[PDB]
Design a protein around this ligand. Structure first.
Ligand SMILES: O[C@@H]1[C@@H](O)[C@H](O[C@@H]2CO[C@@H](O[C@@H]3CO[C@@H](O[C@@H]4CO[C@@H](O)[C@H](O)[C@H]4O)[C@H](O)[C@H]3O)[C@H](O)[C@H]2O)OC[C@H]1O
Ligand SMILES: O[C@@H]1[C@@H](O)[C@H](O[C@@H]2CO[C@@H](O[C@@H]3CO[C@@H](O[C@@H]4CO[C@@H](O)[C@H](O)[C@H]4O)[C@H](O)[C@H]3O)[C@H](O)[C@H]2O)OC[C@H]1O
Ligand SMILES: OC[C@H]1O[C@@H](O[C@H]2[C@H](O)[C@@H](O)[C@H](O)O[C@@H]2CO)[C@H](O)[C@@H](O)[C@H]1O
Ligand SMILES: OC[C@H]1O[C@@H](O[C@H]2[C@H](O)[C@@H](O)[C@H](O)O[C@@H]2CO)[C@H](O)[C@@H](O)[C@H]1O
Ligand SMILES: *[C@@H]1O[C@H](CO)[C@@H](O)[C@H](O)[C@H]1NC(C)=O
Ligand SMILES: *[C@@H]1O[C@H](CO)[C@@H](O)[C@H](O)[C@H]1NC(C)=O
Ligand SMILES: [Co+2]
Ligand SMILES: [Co+2]
Ligand SMILES: [Co+2]
Lengths: 434, 434
């Protein structure tokens, strides 16, 4: 796609700290951009929609190539249309925003410049952020994570994409998502099937795959930390059901691991660690600090700080595994005890280390779940299982929770606030911000 | 040996913090006891010495059994004879103390009660302490470490030892030391050879072996962190040169690893990390906090705090190893690049995990080195090597430094102060002390 300018594109600014081993941190100035899927897609030479509701213009978009030539992405009114605001080092995303039309949530990338994404090499480093999840009920997910996207959003590889990172192109993740309207500088109109339950979305014949570090998927009830390896580390197109992922019939018939080696303290048996109010170790009615460390072995360590008190990731015992570090032994034990082979089939932490050794883009988002109502995060899943199934219970939410239309109607003012991002060598981010 | 009471035994008290995962710490009250080797050893029924200078009484001690029956250990005047004092959570050890006779240094164990050692299970936990090494020049070693000693100092196994932990019996370490005057409830007079350079010591026909976690061996110039595995985890007698260790002809012909997998930041190439004055990352003229974490994988992590600034163990690159965690890959790479096979021959971190999974006793000591002048810690070693030999340079001290008689004459008022010991689950010790 190209870019159009009927609405100007001004990325909300966002600062963050880069810390060094010598013990100081210095402020960096970036900004955030909204993913292309949220944008208005229209004819280059008029305001005629190329995509409307959940269907494509059959005339402007008779095939993927013609569609990309005919169509452009336009700018975003971040606050009024999308409910996205920033203030210094803080970013807030509102759940449902009513303007001329209703918008649901947002997916945002941190930029290095107006036209390029910020890339982070996670390996040997740590990433710290503060979050307020108090306004996230059952069925919502305020997510902070990393994906192996190109810094230009795909322009160098696919010159029919001239919109680039400035317009949030180039997304990929470990679900090999097929709901993207543009992949590899072409539309995804070929094979398009509108969602049966979502007025704004569909599934196309192509998907976009890459490695994913799910640092934080969470609401006020549950939180999970999950690496997802792929056999191709970086962004790669996939064809139809060969994609695997949430958007395909065959979840496991692709190049990525859509399940991941997840660590959810509630799932692992500590139901007292994280939740709303003073009966939990971390009180989710209040802001908390989350720190994630990527040691060179490829294991992941985690601690939290709230009101000046530090807590490592709680210990878990699973099969022969015991401890609080997300390592090979944990992931192998998880598969043994909870089931599945996707994470190991895709090469486990060894393959995942190839992603964190390279550059990844930071994503912050707020979403509800049209496929599974977020039950995999905060409820019992599958819903016919009981607590006697190992790993079935992931949170306290009812198995009836998270129906998108219901949560959008009942909790439109839900929101997430991410703030005080700090990045540097392991051990460095607790030092004073510059 | 038995105990005698011509001098009363009052262990200097010492408090420390036990921290919990829930984020609080509570004060514990223990005390310190001096190792039996430092004590006066005399006939049970008089003040006649069983051991004097570096030789044994041939009449009281004609063999190991008769000697133990005839002889007792007596109490210690901690301050006036040994230069050992405590105040709340602080312990100080002076280098040379002149009373009726000259004493050099001390080795001390933390007690649970007047008659038992405190045991710590290191695995899954972390140990924090503060240290002032400002008064430790080249050739001195203020050491804090753990060994797999019996809590009773050997009494249950060896009933001819009735003195026990109260009198500091039962020592063992990864050098399988043969300088101990009592091992396994018998004397070590058989095979005794007085030291050629030490008026107060010798080497006997028996040694005492066990696993050793050298958390801290350091002076103002260099510091090292070193696990040492043994094929028998706990305390075990050894016979003569079959002992291996510093005190034998054949260093590597025993059940313990006397070299260990050592991590010395200077040795590994960061000569700027630790030293006297503001040109170093950690200024050794001032107190610093040292934290050591024993993750369940069996790897060891380390960070430091000084004036509120936190530093992870500095990154090192060695062969194919890169990072700051002391793990299998580090230790294997060290052997490959610096030489040796002792650590791996004795089972590496896997065998060492058997020690940290069990109970270990905390040892604090101050010593000079009659075998190697501490050059392995703070100088170039062996001394004929140059900087072009990988790992030869371990510190900035001259290869002429650390001659015991010289340092005892020039720096008698050298001292070490250990304080603010805190122990608990990984992530817990930075929380407020109770
Ligand atoms: O000036 C007018 C434009 O503002 C207007 O723009 C519309 C803006 O909203 C667009 O709809 C977006 C599409 O994305 C939705 O989010 C999905 C959430 O689930 C994800 O899996 C998926 O990938 C996302 O696509 C978002 O909720 C929704 O609001 C709409 O298509 C634009 O046309 O157009 C008309 C102009 O007059
Ligand atoms: O009342 C008098 C007693 O106080 C007196 O006791 C003497 C106290 O000092 C004893 O000598 C100790 C022996 O240990 C030395 O340390 C060695 C350091 O290197 C280590 O490897 C080794 O294992 C340690 O043994 C310490 O420096 C030295 O002072 C002496 O033997 C006692 O007899 O006895 C006479 C009473 O009248
Ligand atoms: O709704 C898709 C969701 O699945 C998670 O993986 C689940 C998996 O679907 C389920 O079969 C298993 O029992 O639990 C897994 C972990 O919660 C993914 O982690 C998530 O990214 C989504 O893809
Ligand atoms: O003086 C004995 C001392 O040796 C250390 O191990 C040395 C070893 O002696 C040397 O050959 C090698 O080059 O360096 C090693 C590490 O410094 C031990 O660590 C120490 O405990 C002592 O036993
Ligand atoms: C030494 O280590 C410190 C702490 O990690 C680091 O800040 C410094 O840059 C290192 N210097 C060198 C020269 O290796
Ligand atoms: C849950 O984790 C916290 C933090 O480690 C710990 O303090 C608490 O005891 C744990 N509780 C249970 C019931 O597992
Ligand atoms: Co195709
Ligand atoms: Co680790
Ligand atoms: Co014997």
């Amino acid at each position: 796609q190209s870019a159009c300018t009927l609405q100007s594109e001004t990325h909300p600014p966002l600062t963050w700290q880069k810390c060094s081993s010598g013990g100081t941190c210095t402020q960096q100035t970036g900004s955030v951009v909204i993913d292309a899927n949220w944008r208005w897609t229209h004819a280059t030479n008029s305001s005629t929609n190329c995509y409307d509701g959940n269907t494509w213009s059959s005339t402007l978009c008779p095939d993927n190539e013609t569609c990309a030539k005919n169509c452009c992405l336009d700018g975003a009114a971040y606050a009024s249309t999308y409910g996205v605001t920033t203030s210094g080092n803080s970013l807030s995303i509102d759940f449902v925003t009513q303007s001329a039309q209703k918008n649901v949530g947002a997916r945002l990338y941190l930029m290095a410049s107006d036209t390029t994404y910020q890339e982070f090499t996670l390996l040997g480093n740590e990433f710290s952020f503060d979050v307020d999840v108090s306004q996230l009920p059952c069925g919502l997910n305020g997510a902070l994570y990393f994906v192996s996207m190109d810094a230009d959003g795909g322009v160098s590889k696919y010159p029919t994409n001239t919109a680039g990172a400035k317009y949030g192109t180039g997304y990929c993740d470990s679900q090999c998502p097929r709901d993207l309207k543009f992949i590899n500088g072409q539309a995804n109109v070929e094979g398009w099937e509108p969602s049966s339950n979502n007025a704004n979305t569909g599934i196309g014949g192509h998907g976009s795959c890459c490695s994913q570090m799910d640092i934080w998927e969470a609401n006020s009830i549950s939180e999970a930390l999950t690496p997802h390896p792929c056999t191709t580390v970086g962004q790669e197109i996939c064809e139809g059901d060969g994609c695997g992922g949430t958007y395909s019939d065959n979840r496991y018939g692709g190049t990525c691991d859509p399940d991941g080696c997840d660590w959810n303290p509630y799932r692992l048996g500590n139901t007292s660690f994280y939740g709303p109010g003073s009966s939990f170790t971390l009180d989710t009615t209040k802001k908390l600090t989350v720190v994630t460390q990527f040691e060179t072995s490829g294991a992941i360590n985690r601690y939290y700080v709230q009101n000046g008190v530090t807590f490592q990731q709680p210990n878990a015992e699973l099969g022969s595994y015991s401890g609080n570090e997300l390592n090979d032994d944990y992931c192998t034990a998880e598969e043994a005890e909870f089931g599945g082979s996707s994470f190991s089939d895709k090469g486990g932490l060894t393959q995942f280390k190839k992603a964190t050794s390279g550059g990844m883009v930071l994503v912050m988002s707020l979403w509800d779940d049209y496929y599974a109502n977020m039950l995999w995060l905060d409820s019992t899943y599958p819903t016919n299982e009981t607590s006697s199934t190992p790993g079935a219970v992931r949170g306290s939410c009812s198995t009836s929770s998270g129906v998108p239309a219901q949560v959008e109607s009942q909790s439109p003012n839900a929101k997430v606030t991410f703030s005080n991002i700090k990045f540097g060598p392991i051990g460095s981010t607790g030092n004073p911000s510059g």
